[PDB]
Amino acid sequence: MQKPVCLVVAMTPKRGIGINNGLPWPHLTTDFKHFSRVTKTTPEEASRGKRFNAVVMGRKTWESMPRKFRPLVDRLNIVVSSSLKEEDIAAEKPQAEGQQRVRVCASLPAALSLLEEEYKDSVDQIFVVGGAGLYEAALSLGVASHLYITRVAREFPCDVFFPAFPGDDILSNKSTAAQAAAPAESVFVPFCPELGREKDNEATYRPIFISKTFSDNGVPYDFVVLEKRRKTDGLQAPSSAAAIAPVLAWMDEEDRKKREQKELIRAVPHVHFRGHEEFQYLDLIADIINNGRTMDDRTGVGVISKFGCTMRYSLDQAFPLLTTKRVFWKGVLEELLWFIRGDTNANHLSEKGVKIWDKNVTREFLDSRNLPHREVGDIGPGYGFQWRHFGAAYKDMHTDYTGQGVDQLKNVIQMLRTNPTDRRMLMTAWNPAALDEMALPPCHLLCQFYVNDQKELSCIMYQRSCDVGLGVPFNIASYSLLTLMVAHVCNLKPKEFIHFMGNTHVYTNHVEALKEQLRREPRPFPIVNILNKERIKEIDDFTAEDFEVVGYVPHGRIQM
Amino acid sequence: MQKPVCLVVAMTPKRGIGINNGLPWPHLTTDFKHFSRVTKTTPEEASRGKRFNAVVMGRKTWESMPRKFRPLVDRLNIVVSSSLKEEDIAAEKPQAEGQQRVRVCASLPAALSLLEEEYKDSVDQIFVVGGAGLYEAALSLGVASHLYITRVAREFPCDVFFPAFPGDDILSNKSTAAQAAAPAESVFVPFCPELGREKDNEATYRPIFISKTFSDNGVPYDFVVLEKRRKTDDAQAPSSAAAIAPVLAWMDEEDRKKREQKELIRAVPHVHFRGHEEFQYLDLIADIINNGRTMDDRTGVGVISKFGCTMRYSLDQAFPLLTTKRVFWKGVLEELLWFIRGDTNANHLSEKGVKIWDKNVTREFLDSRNLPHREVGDIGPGYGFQWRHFGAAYKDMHTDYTGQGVDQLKNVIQMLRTNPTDRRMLMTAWNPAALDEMALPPCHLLCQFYVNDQKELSCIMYQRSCDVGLGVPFNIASYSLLTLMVAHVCNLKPKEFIHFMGNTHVYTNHVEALKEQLRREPRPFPIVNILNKERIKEIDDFTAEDFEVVGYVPHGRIQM
Ligand SMILES: NC(=O)C1=CN([C@@H]2O[C@H](COP(=O)(O)OP(=O)(O)OC[C@H]3O[C@@H](n4cnc5c(N)ncnc54)[C@H](OP(=O)(O)O)[C@@H]3O)[C@@H](O)[C@H]2O)C=CC1
Ligand SMILES: NC(=O)C1=CN([C@@H]2O[C@H](COP(=O)(O)OP(=O)(O)OC[C@H]3O[C@@H](n4cnc5c(N)ncnc54)[C@H](OP(=O)(O)O)[C@@H]3O)[C@@H](O)[C@H]2O)C=CC1
Ligand SMILES: CCCCCCc1nc(N)nc(N)c1-c1ccccc1
Ligand SMILES: CCCCCCc1nc(N)nc(N)c1-c1ccccc1
Ligand SMILES: O=c1ccn([C@H]2C[C@H](O)[C@@H](COP(=O)(O)O)O2)c(=O)[nH]1
Ligand SMILES: O=c1ccn([C@H]2C[C@H](O)[C@@H](COP(=O)(O)O)O2)c(=O)[nH]1
């Protein structure tokens, strides 16, 4: 074969692709466009006498399409079938000018042999576009060099599934090969197709491309490209760049001289296009381990730190709940609702199964802070108290503080509702006069809001100290969620959460676990919907039952 | 010629290169390395049967070199002289088979012919390395495709100067006689060397490379590469990339259609390597103008804004006092000293010639803040009051507030001296309970400090609102100077200033003036020295006379 073969498919995390000879989900507008652009684009125009691509499909997929869309315009359509006749297809509807006559072939080898022989001068690329029968044939034959997979993050009822294939761990968690009961079921994919099924000819598909998350009709999804592999596997003029190179070389020495020293950490290095926004997070971990400085801290553990780091997360299609390790969403939600209430009683959290604060409000820890007058659970005048009562005198976690101090959150919302271009829409929890009264000095300590010219809301949060391993994914979810709630009660659309970080670190004893996490490819982000919107007029109206997380498919626990 | 010729030189902004047949400045270590690396660089190594480069020099430069460097090792040395004898040079040292005999030639064309003829197979590159007589011959001949110039930012006394040349405005501001004495005094540079001084054959030298600023022995300097140009131009694996291309093509479509419908602004786009840290600032201005959103601010005058921007400035070799427009240094230093004192009386600044607060402390402006009881000049419980007395109740600018509030600056200095790995070394001016008592709500509102494993101090400052045109360069200088001061009284070395920015904008009526500034190539940064260091033990001990700015050579005023 001289023509490239590719597979294009959209599937759920359990590989579901259809039901009752239709698609399983509501219409996915961006995926529809992607399918058209990929299958219609000549290879010459993408890099940026009639030549065109071919689409090969099974009989049921052909019949599954509305007669309006079939044949797929501007591509050569081949249908694999034993019953359908070419003349009937031509007689289905008038053949527009310049379109190719639809061919019917008895197998996939026959379809490809026809394309190689009869369309030698005219077909550039070949796309196998379904269904399960033809996908199975093309995988078992080994002819697909790349798979274009739209990863639909939600599960739907399905009765037709894409075949299990080597590389399908990109879709969902697999119970290892040391905890698997038996070798996982899978088509054999020949690396060299002419050598067929031989032990030394086993291929697998590895991702080279993972996009940011899209959504349509409440369905999150993204786009990946897998490449067939063996299982065992700045520009200027040529005068300008050559003149500059000796100077760059000596200026670049120190970076090189300490870079190749150790073997650098890198997250899933085979992924070339790193569109997924979670790559910011994975690359930050690698950056700290590779380039941070090790020092002892207050507890004496040993930290590796950098100073001054940033990430940004889009909020308009999906929600940045990180996927390479599960985020404790219930803790995020309950603790944010607690902050918003101005509540300083951590027992109200603990009693909901949210224990994140409890180690820091023990009688022991409070006494260590020289706070023996604090009841167990009382965090002092901390986060939510400064948000809603900044500067008020603090007595204990049971006191009614209504009307005392500055209500920054109310001021922020009122300013967004009346003068959104204002440049003072800030909320701070850093009160130096109160730090000695708190169980813990605040960590996420400042946030600022911004509205552009299209009613789109953004938030920045500044964090003085960030454990990237444990706390950072939680902090991202908290302030992203805060941005959704503020946006809804201010009649704005949530756009971007921006994370500014001071001392950004990982603990040395976590390094091995983090290296294992950095072998994981990120999954598409879930969608967070606000329920009962018509009932929720003010920030205090939200409750824990007013949220749903849709399509969250994180990796499982760490092997350590 | 089949072999390239380049000039390598270090000069002051007045083109001074030497005095008493020596160099004018103390030893510049990094420039010495640069010279060695560039002139010994095989073309092989840099971009990544013995071959070597040649260095061509005048008799006095040869005599100027210490015996240990005479001849320059691993390079073929050619001395242009009418009096030096090759045989006398060869008798000075053993003539080893591993090194090249020094050659003497009567002129530069003879030196170049010898190189092309007798060293056809062995010489890769030719470097003219001084002095003035050889540089003038090489420029007038037209044979140098590139100039490697070390821009020494200080004037030193010199008796030997590099010839005036087209492109020497890279060094300093040109007086009104820019086009006047240049044709009379500037060397004519042929573009095609064989066509001599024909009016059609005029060359000029343009920067393609501007590095960050270095320093040694109290001297700031940077590295530029200029390329010869005509005057009349002035006034992974292929399969992976091809598989990915169609997906990127449709993903980029919306942004592709915005870029080609806009005239995109770019600072000095002929500069390809943009190592100078001021490019962060010029790039930010361009990005705001290209990609910011226009809205009417408080005054309704027109502002273009982004949200969430960052820059970082090194403090270990030079000081980031921006060069494409002069910064009001005296204002920077006096206002910071005023902050540190906890002073809230702007009259103390105004009587020193620093008027920057005057418009915001007038009777009219205070009355508009509903502060009729404020005396003219009283900024309220603002920046330096919050630094030294956070939380204290304000009465007026005459009150003695000793011992009142939290002295954040003192706490930070004490923590840096006793426990520098602490992650709570912050200082904040954002007091939401005091904001209505201030003339202006603080702009630069939080700063955090950090010490690494090498006693090196860094500082982050968060600014909620940044007029990039008029406020940001001043702000950069204020907190960089603060970091120098803090590091000194804590026995630390200043490392880096990190600028975190919220609402980041330019006013629409400054755009044309800003475009003019974006045509300016940055100059090397100056050095800021602290004088009388042994007399200065505490942050309160600094006075205005304890600082000197060394080698500051900014561009002049803007026409627009
Ligand atoms: N989500 C997605 O990306 C896609 C979803 N789909 C969904 O998948 C389902 C249809 O796929 P499916 O149901 O598997 O049916 P197919 O589209 O695979 O067509 C099956 C028929 O094609 C012919 N055929 C298939 N494989 C072979 C083979 N190896 N050799 C010879 N002939 C072959 C036979 O035709 P005959 O019996 O006439 O000989 C067979 O009955 C529908 O629900 C559809 O909506 C379809 C495409 C992509
Ligand atoms: N900062 C820098 O980058 C450098 C600085 N320097 C400084 O520059 C000074 C020396 O430079 P300079 O004083 O200009 O003297 P040169 O090094 O240029 O040597 C001058 C001598 O070289 C010969 N010569 C020079 N030009 C020609 C020509 N066009 N044709 C023929 N012979 C020529 C003559 O030698 P004869 O009289 O024997 O015929 C002339 O007297 C020193 O102070 C040195 O330290 C030097 C190099 C680099
Ligand atoms: C008729 C065109 C629908 C295009 C959107 C659905 C789709 N998406 C992807 N990524 N791959 C596919 N193969 C298909 C598809 C193509 C043909 C029929 C059914 C589904
Ligand atoms: C003995 C070599 C000293 C190298 C440092 C001084 C220097 N810097 C630059 N950028 N260009 C130059 N041509 C020279 C130079 C080379 C030889 C003699 C004097 C100055
Ligand atoms: O919301 C939070 C709270 C805490 N931490 C981590 C960062 C530090 O490792 C530790 C806080 O201790 P100090 O910075 O105060 O030393 O907890 C977070 O990452 N996010
Ligand atoms: O240190 C400062 C102080 C002020 N500004 C600018 C930013 C704003 O354009 C203006 C203050 O206006 P508001 O953001 O407060 O509206 O002054 C600065 O850039 N730096």
Side-chain angles (χ1 to χ4, degrees), chain A residues 1-174 177-560, chain B residues 1-46 48-560:
Chain A
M1 289 200 76
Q2 283 114 33
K3 298 178 189 307
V5 178
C6 290
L7 268 58
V8 187
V9 62
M11 77 192 59
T12 79
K14 300 181 186 174
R15 298 184 268 102
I17 64 175
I19 181 160
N20 289 330
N21 224 49
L23 294 186
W25 40 76
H27 183 68
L28 310 182
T29 313
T30 304
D31 169 80
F32 184 91
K33 175 164 63 166
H34 158 92
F35 177 83
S36 306
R37 300 300 180 78
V38 160
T39 63
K40 284 213 264 282
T41 304
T42 68
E44 124 231 300
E45 219 65 16
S47 35
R48 202 148 251 75
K50 180 167 82 290
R51 287 205 73 99
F52 44 80
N53 299 325
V55 290
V56 187
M57 75 201 76
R59 171 185 51 92
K60 292 177 185 210
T61 304
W62 171 269
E63 295 172 335
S64 84
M65 286 184 290
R67 211 262 316 269
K68 302 75 166 269
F69 288 140
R70 83 196 189 201
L72 300 167
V73 59
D74 300 334
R75 297 144 279 190
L76 169 63
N77 284 235
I78 310 302
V79 184
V80 177
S81 170
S82 61
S83 42
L84 245 61
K85 240 63 73 181
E86 282 189 20
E87 319 83 55
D88 310 335
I89 290 163
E92 257 185 39
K93 76 184 191 186
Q95 147 124 314
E97 282 169 358
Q99 300 299 290
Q100 287 295 311
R101 152 188 203 79
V102 175
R103 314 294 304 271
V104 179
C105 305
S107 76
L108 183 67
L112 300 178
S113 181
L114 176 72
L115 293 165
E116 289 287 328
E117 161 70 15
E118 187 156 335
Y119 297 88
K120 166 165 44 264
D121 302 304
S122 50
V123 164
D124 294 311
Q125 307 185 265
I126 307 172
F127 294 108
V128 170
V129 304
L134 206 43
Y135 289 144
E136 184 283 326
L139 285 167
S140 294
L141 205 52
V143 292
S145 63
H146 296 84
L147 318 184
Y148 296 86
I149 296 175
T150 299
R151 293 191 300 184
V152 174
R154 281 172 66 180
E155 198 50 55
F156 297 86
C158 295
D159 61 20
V160 176
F161 295 84
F162 194 92
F165 65 99
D168 62 7
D169 56 297
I170 200 72
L171 299 167
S172 59
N173 301 336
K174 291 296 185 305
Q179 223 55 224
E185 54 139 28
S186 196
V187 294
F188 191 92
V189 185
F191 183 76
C192 294
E194 52 283 77
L195 309 186
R197 197 191 197 112
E198 306 281 334
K199 57 160 164 289
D200 288 332
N201 194 40
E202 179 158 16
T204 187
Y205 288 93
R206 306 254 47 198
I208 64 185
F209 178 111
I210 308 175
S211 76
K212 81 193 181 191
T213 307
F214 296 77
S215 67
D216 288 296
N217 289 317
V219 184
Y221 60 97
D222 69 10
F223 299 101
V224 306
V225 185
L226 314 190
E227 184 167 279
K228 187 168 80 170
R229 304 277 175 85
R230 286 197 171 271
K231 184 141 297 174
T232 60
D233 226 61
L235 112 109
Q236 59 260 283
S239 211
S240 293
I244 281 170
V247 187
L248 291 184
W250 74 252
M251 285 180 184
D252 195 26
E253 172 180 351
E254 207 41 47
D255 290 338
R256 301 212 153 171
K257 145 73 123 174
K258 69 203 298 181
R259 152 164 48 263
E260 332 150 319
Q261 259 280 149
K262 15 74 185 310
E263 190 240 331
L264 287 192
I265 314 311
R266 177 140 209 252
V268 289
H270 50 276
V271 177
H272 303 322
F273 177 79
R274 299 163 76 89
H276 202 299
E277 299 181 4
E278 184 160 355
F279 282 116
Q280 289 171 110
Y281 172 75
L282 300 165
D283 292 356
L284 181 60
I285 292 162
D287 188 358
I288 294 166
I289 296 171
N290 292 332
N291 307 308
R293 304 295 178 94
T294 303
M295 291 117 61
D296 288 353
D297 73 335
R298 45 171 176 88
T299 74
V301 168
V303 261
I304 319 169
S305 64
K306 291 155 61 61
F307 191 60
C309 306
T310 73
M311 309 176 289
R312 316 174 72 93
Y313 294 92
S314 308
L315 304 177
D316 63 319
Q317 300 268 289
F319 182 94
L321 204 64
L322 297 201
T323 64
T324 55
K325 168 156 139 295
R326 172 174 293 278
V327 171
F328 184 28
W329 165 256
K330 179 162 161 57
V332 169
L333 182 52
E334 296 288 1
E335 178 206 52
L336 173 59
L337 292 176
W338 183 72
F339 289 159
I340 290 174
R341 277 188 290 270
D343 188 347
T344 54
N345 183 348
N347 304 316
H348 297 167
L349 290 183
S350 191
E351 292 166 344
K352 279 170 181 72
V354 176
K355 317 294 199 170
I356 63 190
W357 275 90
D358 289 341
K359 68 189 178 64
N360 294 119
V361 279
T362 66
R363 166 89 278 115
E364 310 88 75
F365 192 97
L366 291 172
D367 286 359
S368 69
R369 300 236 64 208
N370 304 319
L371 296 173
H373 53 299
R374 287 284 188 259
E375 183 173 353
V376 166
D378 195 328
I379 69 158
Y383 286 108
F385 178 92
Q386 298 300 336
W387 284 16
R388 316 299 317 256
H389 308 288
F390 188 99
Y394 188 85
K395 300 316 182 315
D396 67 31
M397 64 190 185
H398 309 285
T399 309
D400 186 0
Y401 294 106
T402 309
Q404 292 180 36
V406 178
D407 187 341
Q408 313 179 73
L409 185 55
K410 179 191 198 284
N411 292 338
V412 169
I413 286 164
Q414 169 80 155
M415 197 60 68
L416 289 163
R417 287 174 167 168
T418 62
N419 182 223
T421 68
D422 177 277
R423 295 187 288 255
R424 297 84 170 267
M425 296 184 296
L426 283 100
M427 187 169 60
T428 183
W430 192 258
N431 181 344
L435 295 176
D436 291 333
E437 303 163 54
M438 306 179 193
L440 309 168
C443 212
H444 42 98
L445 62 86
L446 175 102
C447 63
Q448 179 177 359
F449 296 89
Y450 169 88
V451 182
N452 72 7
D453 60 342
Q454 298 160 26
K455 291 176 163 184
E456 296 170 336
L457 176 70
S458 304
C459 166
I460 287 173
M461 182 274 281
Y462 181 90
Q463 191 173 336
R464 68 171 172 80
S465 181
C466 323
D467 175 8
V468 187
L470 308 163
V472 163
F474 193 103
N475 303 127
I476 292 169
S478 302
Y479 280 91
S480 290
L481 184 54
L482 177 59
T483 305
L484 271 52
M485 294 162 74
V486 168
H488 166 72
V489 304
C490 296
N491 223 290
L492 303 169
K493 287 152 292 158
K495 170 105 289 204
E496 203 166 41
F497 166 64
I498 300 136
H499 197 173
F500 285 171
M501 294 174 269
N503 182 316
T504 317
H505 59 261
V506 319
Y507 289 89
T508 50
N509 59 326
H510 293 167
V511 164
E512 285 307 301
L514 288 169
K515 277 146 135 153
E516 203 43 58
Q517 188 177 347
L518 263 50
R519 304 185 230 279
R520 294 170 178 196
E521 287 114 3
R523 307 252 172 83
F525 278 147
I527 278 173
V528 169
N529 298 308
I530 291 170
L531 310 181
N532 308 309
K533 281 192 176 200
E534 56 290 331
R535 196 202 83 240
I536 296 162
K537 307 305 186 195
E538 313 289 340
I539 196 68
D540 314 275
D541 301 348
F542 291 96
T543 74
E545 337 301 330
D546 293 312
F547 301 86
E548 58 161 4
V549 185
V550 167
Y552 186 43
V553 284
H555 287 262
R557 269 195 33 86
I558 289 290
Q559 283 70 214
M560 301 163 183
Chain B
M1 301 193 64
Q2 327 278 243
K3 302 178 188 294
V5 178
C6 297
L7 270 47
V8 193
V9 65
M11 74 190 70
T12 80
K14 267 56 176 86
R15 292 176 285 105
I17 63 167
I19 190 182
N20 305 316
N21 213 39
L23 299 184
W25 40 74
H27 180 72
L28 307 182
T29 306
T30 295
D31 172 78
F32 185 90
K33 170 173 66 176
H34 161 81
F35 178 85
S36 303
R37 299 287 174 88
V38 177
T39 62
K40 278 208 300 298
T41 253
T42 55
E44 318 137 50
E45 261 264 300
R48 271 101 235 290
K50 185 176 310 191
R51 298 197 65 102
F52 42 84
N53 299 325
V55 294
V56 180
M57 79 197 70
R59 172 187 46 96
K60 297 178 176 180
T61 296
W62 170 266
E63 299 175 20
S64 81
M65 287 191 306
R67 189 154 289 92
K68 63 181 196 173
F69 295 144
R70 225 169 50 215
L72 287 157
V73 61
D74 306 322
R75 286 142 292 185
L76 164 69
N77 286 228
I78 303 178
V79 185
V80 177
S81 178
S82 66
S83 53
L84 252 168
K85 270 60 191 186
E86 278 198 22
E87 324 89 58
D88 300 329
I89 292 167
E92 285 184 29
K93 294 193 179 178
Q95 296 303 285
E97 292 182 337
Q99 297 288 321
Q100 289 298 316
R101 176 188 179 85
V102 178
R103 313 298 302 274
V104 181
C105 305
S107 71
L108 179 59
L112 298 178
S113 307
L114 176 66
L115 286 164
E116 296 282 331
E117 170 68 70
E118 284 190 29
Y119 298 89
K120 166 200 293 80
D121 300 321
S122 51
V123 166
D124 291 310
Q125 299 190 254
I126 302 164
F127 298 93
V128 175
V129 304
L134 216 47
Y135 291 139
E136 159 131 37
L139 285 170
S140 292
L141 200 53
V143 292
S145 64
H146 297 88
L147 309 188
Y148 295 92
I149 296 174
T150 304
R151 296 196 299 190
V152 173
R154 281 166 73 175
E155 289 182 27
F156 288 86
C158 295
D159 59 30
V160 177
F161 297 81
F162 196 86
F165 69 92
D168 61 6
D169 60 298
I170 192 61
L171 298 179
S172 58
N173 297 340
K174 41 160 87 282
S175 58
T176 63
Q179 313 88 359
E185 89 129 340
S186 193
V187 294
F188 188 96
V189 179
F191 184 85
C192 293
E194 54 275 72
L195 308 183
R197 237 178 169 283
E198 301 297 324
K199 168 256 296 175
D200 280 315
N201 193 43
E202 188 159 5
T204 183
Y205 283 103
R206 277 165 118 236
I208 61 178
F209 177 115
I210 303 179
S211 72
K212 80 172 169 183
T213 312
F214 296 77
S215 78
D216 284 285
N217 279 318
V219 187
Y221 58 96
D222 68 12
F223 299 99
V224 304
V225 185
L226 311 185
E227 181 171 278
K228 194 173 74 163
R229 302 281 182 71
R230 283 181 178 281
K231 229 93 174 303
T232 57
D233 309 332
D234 308 308
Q236 52 275 336
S239 216
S240 298
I244 291 173
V247 189
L248 289 182
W250 74 251
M251 287 182 167
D252 180 45
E253 176 182 20
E254 273 323 300
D255 294 359
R256 182 184 315 106
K257 269 70 189 179
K258 311 304 166 62
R259 290 186 306 265
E260 114 259 311
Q261 293 169 17
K262 292 159 58 66
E263 316 226 67
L264 296 172
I265 298 305
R266 171 85 167 173
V268 291
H270 51 272
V271 183
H272 302 313
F273 176 75
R274 299 158 81 82
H276 193 308
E277 284 167 18
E278 182 155 356
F279 281 114
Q280 287 171 114
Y281 172 78
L282 301 169
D283 292 348
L284 178 62
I285 287 162
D287 193 47
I288 295 167
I289 301 174
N290 296 329
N291 296 305
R293 302 291 176 87
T294 294
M295 285 129 69
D296 286 319
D297 74 321
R298 297 186 286 155
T299 56
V301 82
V303 203
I304 316 176
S305 74
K306 297 181 67 63
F307 190 58
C309 312
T310 68
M311 306 178 286
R312 326 171 71 89
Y313 291 95
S314 305
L315 307 176
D316 60 315
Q317 311 205 38
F319 185 94
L321 202 63
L322 298 202
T323 65
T324 47
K325 194 161 138 187
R326 177 175 291 274
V327 180
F328 188 32
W329 171 253
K330 176 183 176 181
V332 173
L333 173 59
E334 290 295 349
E335 184 193 54
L336 175 58
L337 293 176
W338 181 74
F339 286 158
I340 288 189
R341 284 192 281 273
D343 198 351
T344 52
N345 183 354
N347 297 322
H348 294 170
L349 291 171
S350 189
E351 108 224 319
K352 261 145 185 161
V354 178
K355 312 262 174 235
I356 67 193
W357 277 91
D358 280 1
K359 81 181 177 70
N360 289 127
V361 298
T362 64
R363 172 80 280 126
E364 302 83 54
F365 184 81
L366 294 174
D367 291 354
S368 74
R369 291 282 289 151
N370 285 128
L371 306 170
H373 56 293
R374 285 277 187 266
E375 193 190 334
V376 165
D378 197 330
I379 71 154
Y383 287 104
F385 179 90
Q386 294 306 327
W387 288 9
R388 313 304 309 260
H389 310 290
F390 187 101
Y394 193 77
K395 357 246 282 339
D396 72 0
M397 75 200 171
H398 304 290
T399 304
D400 173 17
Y401 297 105
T402 306
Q404 299 187 61
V406 179
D407 184 355
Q408 308 184 79
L409 183 56
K410 167 168 151 191
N411 293 340
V412 167
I413 279 148
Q414 280 310 130
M415 193 58 72
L416 286 165
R417 292 176 166 162
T418 40
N419 187 201
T421 64
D422 176 276
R423 304 189 289 261
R424 303 87 176 275
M425 297 185 301
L426 288 95
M427 185 163 66
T428 182
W430 197 253
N431 186 340
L435 292 173
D436 292 337
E437 294 157 66
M438 310 176 195
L440 298 172
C443 222
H444 36 104
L445 53 92
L446 186 122
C447 69
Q448 185 180 354
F449 289 94
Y450 168 89
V451 182
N452 71 3
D453 60 330
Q454 302 290 1
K455 291 164 181 299
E456 289 176 334
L457 182 72
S458 305
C459 173
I460 290 168
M461 183 269 285
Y462 183 91
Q463 180 177 339
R464 65 174 178 76
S465 182
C466 319
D467 172 13
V468 179
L470 291 180
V472 161
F474 190 107
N475 295 139
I476 290 166
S478 310
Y479 282 85
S480 298
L481 182 65
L482 178 63
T483 304
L484 266 58
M485 295 169 71
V486 169
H488 168 67
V489 303
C490 293
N491 189 39
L492 297 171
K493 303 170 292 184
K495 187 173 123 220
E496 194 173 17
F497 164 65
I498 299 134
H499 200 172
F500 282 170
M501 295 176 283
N503 183 311
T504 303
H505 58 263
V506 310
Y507 292 89
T508 54
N509 54 274
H510 291 170
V511 162
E512 295 306 300
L514 287 166
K515 286 173 180 172
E516 178 76 325
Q517 180 177 358
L518 261 59
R519 296 193 220 277
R520 296 173 173 186
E521 289 117 346
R523 311 246 170 87
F525 279 151
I527 283 179
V528 170
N529 293 312
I530 290 163
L531 310 174
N532 311 299
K533 271 189 170 196
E534 66 299 314
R535 199 210 75 212
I536 303 170
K537 303 297 182 199
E538 304 290 352
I539 195 72
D540 305 292
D541 294 354
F542 292 90
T543 66
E545 292 65 53
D546 293 322
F547 301 90
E548 64 169 4
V549 180
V550 181
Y552 185 40
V553 290
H555 283 87
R557 71 164 269 111
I558 293 279
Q559 306 306 300
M560 341 309 289

